[PDB]
Swiss-Prot record, chain B:
Contains 5 N-terminal periplasmic polypeptide transport-associated (POTRA) domains which interact with other subunits of the complex, may recruit substrates from the periplasm into the outer membrane and also act as a chaperone. The C-terminal region forms a discontinuous 16-stranded beta-barrel transmembrane region. The central pore is ellipsoid, and probably closed by extracellular loop 6, perhaps with the aid of other loops. It comes from the Bacteria. The chain crosses the membrane at residues 402-410, 413-423, 432-439, 443-452, 461-472, 482-483, 500-512, 541-554, 568-577, 586-596, 606-616, 686-695, 710-722, 745-754, 756-766, 781-785. This is Outer membrane protein assembly factor BamA. Residues 411-412, 440-442, 473-481, 513-540, 578-585, 617-685, 723-744, 767-780 are extracellular.
UniProtKB/Swiss-Prot annotation, chain D:
Part of the outer membrane protein assembly complex (Bam), which is involved in assembly and insertion of beta-barrel proteins into the outer membrane. Nonessential member of the complex, which may orient the flexible periplasmic domain of BamA for interaction with other Bam components, chaperones and nascent outer membrane proteins. Efficient substrate folding and insertion into the outer membrane requires all 5 subunits. The gene is bamB. It is a lipid-anchor. InterPro entries: BamB, PQQ_b-propeller_rpt, PQQ_rpt_dom, Quinoprotein_ADH-like_sf, WD40/YVTN_repeat-like_dom_sf. This is Outer membrane protein assembly factor BamB. It comes from Escherichia coli (strain K12). Transmembrane segments: none annotated.
């Protein structure tokens, strides 16, 4: 119930629109790391993919999550940018 | 001339093989006089030989040598001012130790090396001497004697300059002292080197806090008297002028938090310069950045001085750096507790951006638990990463159980046995478990309690209680007093914020009373319940079934569980009877405890403690007398016997049941009783108020490593219990038990020890304000709580 | 206490007491040997006996100290495999608790540092001295210790599943896949990882985890 | 080490106190140099508190009394020359007082605590400060003319060497075991010489006769130096902080262990030694009526024959004891006790 | 007396079993930190193993 106190639960990478706007296709992997910092999650199963999840769960308000997915090629060059701002 | 073969004499344990390895010459070698001289010189140089001499034949040479004795043991005597371990370490570091040999001349150097130790410690007149005793085997036992001399004392601390402040005011803050007040039992004038540096820095800080930005200490001199009993310390200074801070400019990489830092660096016009204030500003900027995840910012403040205007311009350069992330949270030292019992307390998450305040909150929540003696936290940068850290909490576990066992007085009522175990962290699972029992010729008692504080992940608590009580005055049904009771409680608790929680629960109680002695208060209650027993006899019985709704609230912000030094705790508990119960009443009780540290190290602490209780019947009924409050004892007022404070029973003249002479009876008509008789038997009341003031001090003789296990205190206790329904008009000739103003007071000393069996409490108190019928108990001992 | 006799007979009595099984008097003799007669002919055997007797009293910190001293002072010695095995034994004994064992408590979620040190020592022993007589027992103990460490990781993952920290759950199970891929707890962790992916709506990753579960389950 | 018992002496003459006068509260337990001065049949004495008096030399009656005092902490010997009385204090002030009425002639701040006895020569007043500075003050107005810097050890002995003057050069000892000679025109260094052996090695006031400088270090050596070069001529393994007397062809000294010795002027070979006063804290010796006189911390005065070294007389004077030096001049022997009383001994 | 302290509970540990990789994807590359090498099983185990110090003159 709403009477039970709950602390805030934060998960993932801290994302700001200014930081996300600096990513371009063709950027090097280290350049992306410089722009955003290290991603806390990545594909373990054989693809060069980075996941930036910006998830905030307030005590009783609904959760919000932004997901930015970056796919690099075999050489480490960014090839696809996927941004889901909500849900 | 040739060395036909190696020959040696007089040696027993020195190997001839190593000797052959060592000297310039060995078996079969052609040798000459110069080589012989070199060989004997080398044999002398071996160190482990005392002296060497040689026999030369026409064709070959032979040598004989004496072994140097090895040290069998090292012993010390005297050295009252300093115990033996570091002396042993210094002596061994000087090149002499057990299992190795020494020359007689080495004592001349060992004595100087040892006297230098006392010279450094502060005893310049000390002297040392040593003696060696031979063993039956070729070994020496070393006896060493210290004649430690008079310790030197500080004669004067003089400051040259210091036109702005007097010397006494300046040196009042120093740790060194040249004069001691009459009333000091501790503290001494004895000089110490590294303490002087701290006092010099204290002088620096004193002047820097008053705006003397260009203060410097020119030089300091320490000198001895010719007899080496006195010490003189002189400090030369140039204080200069005092400057007022013109303004603060902040620049660099603010990471978007410029406004907050500008608020942190705000100043009023014309304020004097102050070093500690700018240091606080820097630390506050670091703290502010730390909340947003900037763990390693660069903060540097550079003051710029105007010579003519005598004002300070302050430049602060800030670089926030990167925002850091928590990769792992680790726990070390939890050999008994589950990982989850500690992880549930965390406010910082794994796999999220760092918040330093969240880490601090987790540390504080761990300290508040009481399961650990110490808690430390370390933020370790992940090697090879620019922006990731691991957070490690290091704990030491402590005994959370208590074993309360005791034996009652062997009076005519027979031996009484009491036992019980209370455990807060059962098997490291976080469950609270308690078992209590008591066996007496009259009474058999049992109680069981189990609580799980984390019935849900959010900290909802669930727990229950069972108890059984049975008092029989005699082993027969021949109209003797009996009191049987049992019941159940179940409670649900949940938090409402970081520091506050609420409770709700249900309870059942059975009570069965038989053959009560007629007395005023019990029988006023019995009339309130609609019973009309006869006051002239003990043939009576009363039975009730009760259901209550339980409610509670607790505030807790203590700095740690077992020996608090800061914060306070407030607990509220209450009951109300559910419709359908036999009794109809409410009852509420309030507990508070507040700790105020009067010391930077929290060694001197003032504790304020209070207790309150009030209950009353709801309909025409009254509150049952078995729910009454009691006062007196180690829990409430230490100078008084347990439950003695408060109203006393008034008995009616009645025929005693199971009567036999050679027994004491109250208002027994068999003994000729004819009127109401006043007694000392405490009966409790429906209103209660207790307050205590305590002063917590360091323990005089316990060492630092054991200081956390002992607490000593001086206390002032006061309390009172009274009956709000006592009708003083009907009973004018007896004490007015409705008056709340009969305050008992006591004072004494208490000592708390965290023993292997749990906390032990010893106290001695003098109850210097008493009332009629109060029973004193000056010495008290208790287990648990 | 110990007489002033030469090392020979005091060492003989130390052997006698050690055979008798009174470890404490054996320690009193052997420590007298060590203190009074350093670098004697008996010093190596004295240190080995000291390690053994300390281990039998369960004077575990002293056993650690003696073992470390022996390794440091004797970098190579024909009996060093024994000392490595004793190091592993002492570390793996520090990981136990008598009272909890009596009640049947599963201790795998308590502090795993001692078990990790024991794993390090036994692994070093087995890959350093494969033909020694202690290697089979050390291998069995290594299997047990790997299971225990994987279980600790699984318990942390389960807690964060209950808290709702999905990134932490994903990363913990990934670490389990990297470090303990062949343990049972790693098999138990896969559904947690798939659930954590689905909670963040990372469907493409959850499908991969589901494929792993389907391929390995039977 | 225990303090030696008071020796049993059969007095060959009975010394008596001519007069006594109290001077405030004296120096007390503070180790200091303050001692009385005699000039023109007038005695000048002071105390640490700041009191200074003029006393008639043959009766002890007061002439004038003033206070320089917060205490002044007067710790520097009373010196009188040319109508001025000079006192230094631990607040780094040197006072010049008129001998006629005791009013302040001038007051000057110096570089440090003026522990040493002021020395007056060639129109200058020489001061040696605790922080290792030697300074010259004009005797008329009190202005500082020149300063000399001397190295200070980390740990030293309380007190400072007072310079001596010869042919325009001032010779002074140092806390680091050096004897320094400086030209008094501007304080230019002439030569410097170490007199310690291979630890505390503070130095005493030197004495010059026939072109030879005699100096004495605490644990170091008694040595004779050439006044021109400073080269060492001979040395002896003796040590003291007390002043020593050079008379005729003998040297009288009291070592750091309170042993009284006589030495030859050339070579420094020992003539005799007296050891009965061992570890009794003795004052510096003085010659009076052909005898050697020393006080002790218990308040006895001991009279020593200069030929063989045996005691000739013994008298109990004051209960507070004697720390600072006695004074003998113009046929009068003077000494001031710790409590501040000044005695005239006959 | 001669045996190791504790219990033989470690001998009851279940054997390790490697995971199978589904087609079209790999499993995470393994660290070497906990690789257990294959070795001869001829040695004694449990209470059967003598742990008294080996004799050497």
């Amino acid at each position: 119930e709403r009477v039970v106190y709950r602390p805030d639960i934060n998960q993932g990478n801290y994302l700001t629109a200014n930081d996300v706007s600096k990513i371009r296709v063709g950027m090097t992997q280290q350049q992306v790391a410089y722009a955003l910092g290290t991603p806390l999650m990545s594909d373990p199963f054989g693809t060069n993919t980075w996941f930036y999840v910006f998830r905030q769960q307030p005590g009783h308000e609904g959760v919000t999550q932004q997901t930015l997915t970056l796919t690099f090629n075999s050489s480490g060059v960014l090839t696809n940018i996927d941004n889901k701002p909500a849900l | 001339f040739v060395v036909k073969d190696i020959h040696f004499e007089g040696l027993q344990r020195v190997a001839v093989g190593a000797a052959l390895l060592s000297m310039p010459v060995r078996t079969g070698d052609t040798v000459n006089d110069e080589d012989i001289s070199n060989t004997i010189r080398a044999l002398f140089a071996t160190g482990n030989f005392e002296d060497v001499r040689v026999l030369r034949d026409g064709d070959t040479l032979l040598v004989q040598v004496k072994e140097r004795p090895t040290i069998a043991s090292i012993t010390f005597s005297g050295n009252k001012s300093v115990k033996d371990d570091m002396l042993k370490q210094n002596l061994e570091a000087s090149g002499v130790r057990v299992g190795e040999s020494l020359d007689r001349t080495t004592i001349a150097d060992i004595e100087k090396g040892l006297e230098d130790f006392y010279y450094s410690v502060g005893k310049y007149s000390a002297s040392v001497k040593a003696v060696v005793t031979p063993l039956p085997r070729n070994r020496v036992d070393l006896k060493l004697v210290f004649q430690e001399g008079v310790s030197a004392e500080i004669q004067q601390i003089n400051i040259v300059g210091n036109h702005a402040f007097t010397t006494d005011e300046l040196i009042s803050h120093f740790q060194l002292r040249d004069e001691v007040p009459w009333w000091n039992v501790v503290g001494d004038r004895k000089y110490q080197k590294q303490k002087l540096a701290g006092d010099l820095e204290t002088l620096r800080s004193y002047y820097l806090d008053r705006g003397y930005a260009r203060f410097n200490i020119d030089s300091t001199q320490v000198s001895l008297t010719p007899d080496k009993k006195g010490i003189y310390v002189t400090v030369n200074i140039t204080e200069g002028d005092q400057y007022k801070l013109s303004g603060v400019e902040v620049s660099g990489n603010l990471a978007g938090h410029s406004a907050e830092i500008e608020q942190l660096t705000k100043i009023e016009p014309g304020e004097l310069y102050n070093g500690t204030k700018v240091t606080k500003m820097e630390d506050d900027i670091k703290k502010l950045l730390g909340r947003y995840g900037y763990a390693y910012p660069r903060v540097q403040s550079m003051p710029e001085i105007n010579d003519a205007d005598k004002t300070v311009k302050l430049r602060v350069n800030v670089d926030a750096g990167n925002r850091f992330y928590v990769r792992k949270i680790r726990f070390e030292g939890n050999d008994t507790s589950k990982d989850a019992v500690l992880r549930r307390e965390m406010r910082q998450m794994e796999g999220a951006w760092l918040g330093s305040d969240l880490v601090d909150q987790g540390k504080e929540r761990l300290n508040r638990l009481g399961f650990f003696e110490t808690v430390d936290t370390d933020t370790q940068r992940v090697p090879g990463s620019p922006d990731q850290v691991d957070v490690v909490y290091k704990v030491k576990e402590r005994n959370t159980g208590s074993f309360n066992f005791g034996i009652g007085y062997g009076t005519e009522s027979g031996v009484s046995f009491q036992a019980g175990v209370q455990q807060d962290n059962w098997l490291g699972t976080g469950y609270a478990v308690g078992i209590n029992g008591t066996k007496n010729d009259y009474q058999t008692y049992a109680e069981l309690s189990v609580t799980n504080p984390y019935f849900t992940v959010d900290g909802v608590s669930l727990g229950g209680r069972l108890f059984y009580n049975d008092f029989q005055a005699d082993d027969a049904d021949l109209s003797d007093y009996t009191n049987k009771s049992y019941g159940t409680d179940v409670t649900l608790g949940f938090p409402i914020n970081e520091y506050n929680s609420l409770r709700a629960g249900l309870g059942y109680v059975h009570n069965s009373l038989s053959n009560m002695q007629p007395q005023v208060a019990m029988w006023r209650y019995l009339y309130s319940m609609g019973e009309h027993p006869s006051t002239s006899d003990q043939d009576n019985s009363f039975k009730t079934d009760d259901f209550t709704f339980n409610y509670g609230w607790t505030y807790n912000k203590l700095d740690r569980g077992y020996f608090p030094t800061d914060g306070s705790r407030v607990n509220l508990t209450g009951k109300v009877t559910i419709p359908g119960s036999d009794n109809e009443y409410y009852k509420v009780t309030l507990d508070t405890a507040t700790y105020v540290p009067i010391d930077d190290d929290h060694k001197w602490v003032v504790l304020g403690r209070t207790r309150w209780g009030y209950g009353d019947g709801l309909g025409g009924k009254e509150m049952p007398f078995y729910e009454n409050f009691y006062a007196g004892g180690s829990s409430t007022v230490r100078g008084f016997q347990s439950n003695t404070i408060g109203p006393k029973a008034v008995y009616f003249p009645h025929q005693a049941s199971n009567y036999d002479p050679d027994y004491d009876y109250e208002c027994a008509t068999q003994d000729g009783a004819k009127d109401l008789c006043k007694s000392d038997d405490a009966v409790g009341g429906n209103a209660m108020a207790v307050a205590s003031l305590e002063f917590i001090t360091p323990t005089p003789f316990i060492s630092d490593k054991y200081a956390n296990s002992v607490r000593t205190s001086f206390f002032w206790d006061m309390g009172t219990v009274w009956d709000t329904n006592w009708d003083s008009s009907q009973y004018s000739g007896y004490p007015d038990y409705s008056d709340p103003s009969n305050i008992r007071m006591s004072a004494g000393i208490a000592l708390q020890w965290m023993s292997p069996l749990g906390p032990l409490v010893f106290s001695y108190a003098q109850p210097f304000k008493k009332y009629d019928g109060d029973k004193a108990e000056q010495f008290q001992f208790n287990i648990g709580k | 206490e110990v007489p002033d006799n030469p090392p020979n007979e005091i060492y003989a009595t130390a052997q006698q007491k050690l055979q008798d099984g009174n470890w404490r008097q054996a320690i009193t003799q052997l420590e007298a040997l060590d203190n009074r007669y350093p670098f004697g002919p008996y010093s190596q055997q004295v240190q080995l006996d000291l390690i053994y007797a300390y281990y039998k009293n369960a004077d575990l910190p002293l056993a650690q100290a003696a073992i470390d001293r022996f390794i440091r002072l004797n970098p190579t010695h024909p009996n060093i495999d024994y000392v490595m095995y004793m190091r592993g034994l002492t570390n793996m004994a520090l990981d136990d608790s008598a009272l909890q064992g009596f009640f049947g408590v599963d201790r795998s979620d308590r502090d795993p540092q001692h078990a990790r040190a024991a794993f390090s020592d036994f692994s070093k022993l087995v890959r350093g001295y494969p033909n020694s007589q202690y290697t089979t027992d050390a291998t069995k103990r290594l299997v047990f210790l790997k299971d225990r460490l994987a279980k600790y990781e699984y318990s942390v993952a389960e807690y964060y599943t209950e808290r709702g920290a999905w990134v932490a759950v994903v990363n913990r199970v990934e670490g389990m896949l990297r470090d303990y891929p062949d343990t049972q707890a790693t098999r138990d962790a896969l559904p947690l990882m798939e659930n954590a992916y689905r909670q963040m709506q990372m469907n493409a990753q959850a499908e991969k985890v589901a494929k792993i579960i389907a391929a390995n389950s039977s | 080490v225990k303090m030696s018992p008071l020796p049993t002496v059969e007095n060959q003459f009975t010394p008596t106190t001519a007069w006594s006068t109290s001077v405030g509260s004296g120096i007390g337990n503070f180790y200091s140099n303050l001692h009385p001065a005699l000039a023109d049949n007038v005695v000048y004495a002071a105390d640490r508190a700041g009191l200074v008096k003029a006393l008639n030399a043959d009766d002890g009656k007061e002439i004038w009394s003033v206070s320089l005092a917060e205490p002044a902490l007067l710790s520097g010997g009373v010196t009188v020359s040319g109508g001025h009385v000079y006192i230094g204090s631990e607040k780094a002030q040197v006072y010049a007082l008129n001998t006629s009425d005791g009013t302040v002639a001038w007051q000057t701040k110096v570089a440090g605590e003026a522990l040493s006895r002021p020395v007056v020569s060639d129109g200058l007043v020489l001061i040696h400060t605790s922080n290792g500075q030697l300074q010259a003050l004009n005797e008329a107005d009190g202005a500082v003319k020149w300063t000399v810097n001397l190295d200070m050890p980390s740990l030293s002995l309380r007190g400072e060497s007072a310079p001596t003057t010869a042919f325009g050069a001032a010779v002074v000892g140092g806390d680091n075991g050096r004897v320094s000679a400086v030209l008094m025109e501007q304080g230019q260094m002439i030569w410097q010489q170490r007199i310690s052996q291979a630890l505390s090695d503070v130095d005493t006031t030197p004495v010059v006769v026939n072109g030879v400088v005699f100096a004495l270090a605490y644990n170091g050596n008694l040595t004779a130096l050439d006044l021109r070069s400073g080269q060492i001529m001979w040395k002896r393994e003796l040590g003291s902080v007390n002043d020593f007397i050079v008379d005729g062809n003998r040297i009288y000294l009291v070592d750091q262990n309170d042993r009284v010795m006589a030495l030859t002027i050339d070579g420094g070979v020992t003539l005799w030694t007296q050891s009965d006063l061992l570890h009794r804290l003795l004052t510096s010796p003085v010659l009076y009526n052909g005898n050697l006189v020393v006080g002790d911390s218990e308040g006895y005065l001991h009279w020593i024959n200069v030929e063989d070294g045996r005691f000739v007389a013994q008298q109990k004077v004051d209960s507070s004891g004697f720390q600072t030096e006695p004074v003998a001049a113009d046929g009068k022997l003077l000494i001031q006790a710790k409590d501040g009383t000044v005695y005239s001994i006959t | 007396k001669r045996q190791v302290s504790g219990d033989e509970a470690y001998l009851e540990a279940a054997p390790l079993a490697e995971l199978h990789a589904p087609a079209g994807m790999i499993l995470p590359v393994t660290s070497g930190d906990y690789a257990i090498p294959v070795t001869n099983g001829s040695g004694a185990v449990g209470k059967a193993l003598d742990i008294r110090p080996p004799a050497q003159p």
